[PDB]
């Protein structure tokens, strides 16, 4: 039964309805309280707005991010 399949999320990309695995998130460095947007699977180096600090190193996937920070999904 392929219409009401529910565990297509674990499926490979371009499943029954193709849908990107990436997303966007906001980052709050503790003691920094900065507001800026970040892309999952980011491809280049990125900096903060309030106080410049390295945030995530671009890798072949979801980046390494930092040892701290509170990062929250931007999904609605």
């Amino acid at each position: 039964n392929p219409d009401p399949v529910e565990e297509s999320k674990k499926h490979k990309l371009k499943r029954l309805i193709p849908t990107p695995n990436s997303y966007f998130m906001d980052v709050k460095c503790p003691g920094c309280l900065q507001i800026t947007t970040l892309f999952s699977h980011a491809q280049n180096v990125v900096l903060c707005g309030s106080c410049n600090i390295m945030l995530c190193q671009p890798t072949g996937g979801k980046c390494k991010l930092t040892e701290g920070c509170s990062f929250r999904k931007k999904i609605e």
């Binding site: 849908t19 990107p20 966007f24 892309f39 980011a42 491809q43 931007k74 999904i75 609605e76």
Partner: protein, 149 residues
């Protein structure tokens, strides 16, 4: 895959949401100005979209504004006479020829140069079938080195 083997289904899949993301409170009255500034500072549209996605958090320019980036870049007259991929293929062929004029024994480089020149000719035929290239465009292999412009 045009040459060689390997399907390589790696790609980017757009979301079902064709509209601008709801969480984006930013306005399209200056996204095009941003890409215009990027192009003036000197960036090809392929990487303009990427730096827009990463450093500005505004994915799918087509969703933020109802128009695509090369289209609006043309609408401002910015777009170069030679398109993205044709220019990149020309640059790669030029680099290969420069390597080959020193290493005459690189048979593999010669084979790859033939392949990339074939791709150049196919793409050129397409682009001048569209009005996107003057009808006399030819890609002389002698003059390609400076043709990059």
């Amino acid at each position: 895959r045009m040459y060689g083997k390997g399907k390589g289904i790696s790609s980017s899949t757009l979301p079902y949401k064709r509209k601008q993301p709801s969480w984006l409170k930013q306005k399209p009255s200056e996204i095009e100005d941003a890409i215009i500034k990027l192009a003036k500072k000197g960036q090809t549209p392929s990487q303009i979209g990427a730096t827009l996605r990463d450093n500005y958090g505004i994915p799918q320019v087509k969703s933020v504004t109802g128009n695509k980036i090369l289209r609006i870049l043309r609408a401002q007259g910015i777009a170069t006479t030679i398109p993205e991929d044709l220019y990149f293929l020309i640059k790669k062929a030029v680099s290969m020829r420069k390597h080959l004029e020193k290493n005459k024994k690189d048979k593999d480089c010669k084979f790859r140069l033939i392949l990339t020149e074939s791709k150049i000719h196919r793409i050129s035929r397409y682009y001048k079938r569209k009005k996107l290239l003057p009808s006399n465009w030819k890609y002389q292999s002698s003059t390609a080195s400076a043709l990059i412009a």
